[PDB]
Subunit: 229 residues, 3 copies
C-alpha cells in the first residue's frame, strides 16, 4: 500500500494509502507524489493534481534529512507547477501532513477533518512545514498550533484559511472547480504562480534554513531522548 | 469620468460611465488624482469617498504606471480614503478598493480577479491586495477567477464592514476621524508603510511583469478575441 | 510594585493592580514584569507566565520606558515558557501591545481592544510590529486609524484574541494539560525558530522607538499630550 494514481477527466488522483493507515511521508510516498506531478504535467488535458488520503487519515508527515529535502522540494514544485494542486482532506492531517495540505493551491476538507502540529511532543519543531503554513494562515494560527500541539477542526482551520472550503464531498468541490479552471491556459497558471512567489517574503534560502534547523533539532539530546522512546 | 461632490469633511468621487463598466481609463485615473489634490488642499476634508454607480464599483483598467502611482498616494495622503462598494469590483477595481484605507460594502457587492481568463495576472493589484487579505485569499481569488460575496470578502478583510448604507457608515466614522489632526493621519500611514515588507520597488516589478505578460502569446491571443 | 505575583501549580501569575485603575506600564511596573519573568524562568516547574489585569482593566499602555517595553515584549518572544495574556476588560494602546506580544491571548466577552494614540497625535509605534504579526496589516491599521475599541469576539476574528472564554484561569488550567508534556528547551527552540518565520527583526524595535520618540516631540503630539496632562 502506497500512492494509488487514477486518471479522471482533467484530473490526476493521487490517493495516499499505507499498510498501517498512518499515510506517513516516506521517501517512497514523496517520490510517488513527485512522479504523479510529472505525469500530471506531461498531460496537456490534466488541470488538477488531486491529493487525498484514506480511512480517516489524510497524512501524518515524515516517519521516524533526505526526507526533509525531498519534502521541501516537493512543496516548492506545488508552488510552481502550471496546474492546480488540490488537497482534499477527509480526516487526520498531522505534522508534515499539514505542510503537504498547506503547500497545495487549495485545501478542501470535510467537517471531521482535524489539523495538528504535534512535533513539540517529540522535542521537534515543524521547521519544514512553517514557511508555507505561515504564508497560508498568517503567523499566529501556525504558532498557536505548534505551541499547543492540539488539533484544530476543519471549521476552525477554515477561519484562518488553512482550509479554503469545508464541504460534504471534496470530489464534488473539485468537479465544481474544473468548470472555471478548464477555461485557463496552463501557461497563465504557471505565470500566476511565478508572480505570487514574489508576492511573499520567503525564498529558496528559507528552505535551506528550514532543513538546517530541522536536522540540528533532531540531533539535540531532548529530541534524541523522546524519539528513541 | 469622476463626478465630484463636496459634503461636510468629505469629497465624494463618484465613478460614472456610459457602458456602466466604470473602467479605469487614463482620464478616469487622471481625475481621481485631481480629486485627491482637491481633498488634500481643503483643510476641512478628512475623507476622500470613492464609489461607483449602477451596481458597478470599478471593473479595472481599459496606464498601469498611473494606476500604481494613484494607489501609492492612497497609502500616503494625510486623509482617509474610503472605498464605498455597492456592486461589482473586478480586476483593477479590486486594487482601487484594496488600496483605500477602508472598504465599506453592501451585501450585494462582489469582488473578483478574472485576469487569468485573458492570459493575465493582476500584477498591479496583488502587492496591496496581499497586504490587506494575506497571501491565500488573494491567491485563491486569482486562481479561481470566481467572484466573492461582500460577506466572504469581510472574513479576510478585503471588506472592512458590510453595511446596508455605506454613506451612513462614512458619516459614523467622521465622528472619531474629525478629532484627528491630518498630520497624525499622515504620520500613521507613513509608519504603517514600514510595517509591511513591500516597497516602491514592488511597484516597478509589478509594472514590468504586467507589461511582459500583456505582450505574451497567450495574453495577445485572448485579449485580441475579447476586443474583436 | 503595581504588579502582584502569585505562584500556582506550573504557573506564575502576574496581576497588574493600580489605585487609579488604569494599570499603566511605568518604569516600576515594567521592571516588576521583567523580574517576574526572571522568577518564572528560574523555576523548572513553571510552564506559564500568566499576565492579567484587575477591576475591568487589563492595561492602558505606558505612563526610555519605550525601550524597556520593547525589550520586555522581545523577551516574551524568546522566553522558554508560555506567556499567556488573560484579558478581562480594557486593553488600550500599549496594553494591546503587551497582550499581542504574549504567546496566547485569552479574553472574556466584556473585553475591548483599542489604539487611541492618534487622538493625542501619536502612533502606537512600539505596539504595531507585534500587533501586525498577530493580526495581519489591515486589522491593526483599521484599529489605529479609527481609534474605536473592538470587542473580544471581533478581536478573535483576526487572532488578536486566540480564544473568548467565560473564565481565562480555567482556559490556562486546560492549556497546562498539553504544555506540561513539553520540555522547556523545546518551547525555546520553537520560539527562536518562529522568530525566523516573520519579516520583523531587532532593527524593527530600534526603528519603532526612534519613530515614537520623534512623534512624542512633534508639534501636534506635544500640544494634545500637554492638553491631556493639564
Amino acid at each position: 500500500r502506497g500512492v494509488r494514481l487514477t486518471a479522471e477527466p482533467h484530473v490526476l488522483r493521487a490517493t495516499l494509502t499505507s499498510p498501517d493507515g498512518l499515510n506517513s511521508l516516506s521517501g517512497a510516498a514523496l517520490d510517488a507524489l513527485g512522479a504523479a506531478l510529472d505525469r500530471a504535467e506531461a498531460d496537456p488535458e490534466c488541470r488538477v493534481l488531486l491529493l487525498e488520503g484514506s480511512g480517516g487519515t489524510f497524512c501524518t508527515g515524515l516517519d521516524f534529512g533526505r526526507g526533509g529535502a525531498e519534502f521541501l522540494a516537493l512543496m516548492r514544485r506545488f508552488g510552481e507547477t502550471p496546474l492546480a494542486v488540490v488537497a482534499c482532506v477527509d480526516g487526520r492531517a498531522a505534522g508534515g501532513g499539514v505542510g503537504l495540505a498547506a503547500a497545495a493551491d487549495l485545501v478542501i476538507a470535510t467537517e471531521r477533518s482535524e489539523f495538528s502540529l504535534p512535533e513539540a511532543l517529540w522535542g521537534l519543531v515543524p521547521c519544514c512545514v512553517l514557511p508555507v503554513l505561515v504564508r497560508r494562515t498568517g503567523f499566529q494560527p501556525a504558532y498557536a498550533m505548534a505551541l499547543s500541539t492540539q488539533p484544530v477542526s476543519a471549521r476552525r482551520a477554515a477561519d484562518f484559511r488553512l482550509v479554503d472550503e469545508v464541504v460534504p464531498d471534496p470530489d464534488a468541490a473539485v468537479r465544481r472547480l474544473l468548470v472555471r479552471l478548464t477555461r485557463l491556459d496552463p501557461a497563465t497558471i504557471g505565470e500566476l504562480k511565478q508572480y505570487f512567489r514574489a508576492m511573499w517574503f520567503t525564498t529558496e534560502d528559507t528552505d535551506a534554513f528550514a532543513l538546517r534547523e530541522f536536522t540540528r533539532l533532531i540531533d539535540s539530546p531532548v529530541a534524541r531522548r523522546r524519539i528513541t522512546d
